[PDB]
């Protein structure tokens, strides 16, 4: 009721600070990406379009700032009530589609490292068109409504009944197309990334154990340090053979263990000098069959060193963390619209926490630039 006025008077100032922070940071991001990076990779095109969508949304943000400040007294008219809400919904849809495409591109780049810039631009245009199409409900049904006989006007959503089933659809098309289907694609594209990293790390971790113990054999001539070092090498050779990133990889390690078994043979008798001679041959086998598969493991793990992967992970994680309040509360509204819940408290919590969730959901719009300078060590110099 009127008690909510005290908290809600601070909503417009949060909108204003978000607007200024975003309109500065995302503009800087645009100029940085276009100039110091020159859009030389596919990951740059998607991020630049994310920044452009942020610009487009933040341009129409201050209308809602005064709309909440004036306590729902939208004066800008119908031609802006039908475009500001459209801009908000389009921002949501375009941002989530761009994030899904970014995650798919990261998976393809670090799991399948095999002109795509033009393909990126085409996909970007398709994403913008699809987001504009999904913003059609705000294009059509959003309309200025005169409250009572007074002169108060609100950018109300006109559920014209007896010709529309949408009330169920709109609350669900957001929760499905804007958060659910994108989540499955992104989670799948990042679980597959983890599997490819785990296989690459296992080969690198086990081959390290071969390297350190190989150094131990040369430096020690105790006739038992060779046994201890060789035993840990054979166990590492077997483990690395199972870290599949086909016959060449298996045949490459079958000979490798055979040399360790040969070296372990004379370590038993006491021929220390002959022990490291057989262990020295391990380098020859490595350079032939294993080094080819050893560079890919480091190359794949080197993609985590890229600042792009750090930035995209931060952007994707925050977007779905900040949208989990509103998307959950949106589903609650959908259930309450069909009569599933008939609780005053449920209706009250949905109708009073939703103002905060919208601010929370679009809070990420002014935090995308802050993820560039925080994790983009290169971006700091710009």
């Amino acid at each position: 009721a009127g008690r909510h006025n005290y908290i809600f008077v601070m909503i417009p100032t949060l909108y204003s600070i978000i607007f200024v922070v975003g309109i500065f940071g995302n503009s800087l991001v645009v100029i940085v990406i276009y100039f110091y990076m020159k859009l030389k990779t596919v990951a740059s095109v998607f991020l630049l379009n994310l920044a452009l969508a942020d610009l487009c949304f933040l341009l129409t943000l201050p209308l809602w700032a005064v709309y909440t400040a004036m306590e729902y007294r939208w004066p800008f008219g119908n031609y802006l009530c039908k475009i500001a809400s459209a801009s908000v919904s389009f921002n949501l849809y375009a941002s989530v589609f761009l994030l899904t495409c970014l995650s798919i591109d990261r998976y393809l780049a670090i799991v399948h490292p095999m002109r795509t810039m033009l393909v990126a631009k085409v996909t970007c245009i398709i994403i913008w068109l699809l987001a504009g199409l999904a913003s059609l409900p705000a294009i059509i049904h959003r309309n200025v409504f005169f409250i009572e006989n007074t002169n108060i006007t609100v950018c109300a959503f006109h559920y014209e009944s007896q010709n529309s089933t949408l009330p169920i659809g709109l609350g669900l098309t957001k929760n499905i197309l804007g958060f659910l289907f994108p989540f499955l694609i992104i989670l799948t594209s990042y679980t597959l990334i983890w599997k490819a990293l785990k296989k690459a790390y296992d080969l690198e971790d086990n081959w390290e154990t071969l390297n350190d113990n190989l150094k131990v054999i040369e430096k020690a001539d105790n006739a038992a340090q060779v046994k201890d070092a060789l035993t840990k090498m054979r166990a590492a050779a077997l483990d690395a053979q199972k870290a599949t990133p086909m016959k060449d990889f298996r045949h490459g390690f079958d000979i490798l263990v055979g040399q360790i078994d040969d070296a372990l043979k004379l370590a038993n008798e006491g021929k220390v000098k002959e022990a490291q001679a057989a262990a020295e041959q391990l380098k020859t086998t490595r350079n032939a069959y294993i080094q080819k598969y050893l560079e890919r493991a480091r190359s794949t793990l080197d993609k985590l060193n890229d600042d792009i992967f750090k930035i995209i992970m931060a952007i994707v994680l925050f977007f779905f963390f900040s949208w989990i309040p509103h998307q959950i509360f949106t589903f609650l509204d959908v259930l309450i619209q069909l009569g599933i819940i008939r609780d005053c408290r449920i209706a009250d919590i949905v109708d009073t926490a939703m103002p905060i969730t919208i601010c929370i959901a679009y809070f990420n719009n002014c935090l995308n630039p802050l993820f560039y300078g925080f994790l983009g060590k290169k971006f700091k110099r710009y």
Epitope: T68, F145, I147, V154, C155, F157, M354
Partner: nanobody
């Protein structure tokens, strides 16, 4: 889902425009009636709910009376002196003003 009702009548007569609504669109939503005169836009005629006092248009306050019913989930509009330019089509809207404002309209009923 917003229903409607009513019909035509001779000048000076009276009839009860009815409009039933679902449990959601009645309990928390300000149920009201808007008249859309031919060659004109919709204008406020009445309202009975929404946690606010009932409101009539200044041109209809004399001979209009909107009523409700807690049992059958309906709202009735009781016109008394139907003359002048009251000939129009009446929409039964149920608007709830929030951070996602909604206006549930309904099928119009021509009245003459």
């Amino acid at each position: 889902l917003v229903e409607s009702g009513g019909g035509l009548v001779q000048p000076g007569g009276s009839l009860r425009l009815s409009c039933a609504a679902s449990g959601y669109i009645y309990s928390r939503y300000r149920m009201g009636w808007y008249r859309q005169a031919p060659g004109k836009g919709r204008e406020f005629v009445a309202a009975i709910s929404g946690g606010s006092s009932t409101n009539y248009a200044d041109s209809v306050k004399g001979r209009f009376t909107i009523s409700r019913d807690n049992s059958k989930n309906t709202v009735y509009l009781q016109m008394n002196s139907l003359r002048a330019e009251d000939t129009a089509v009446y929409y039964c809207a149920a608007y709830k003003i929030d951070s996602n404002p909604r206006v549930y309209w309904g099928q119009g009923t021509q009245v003459t």
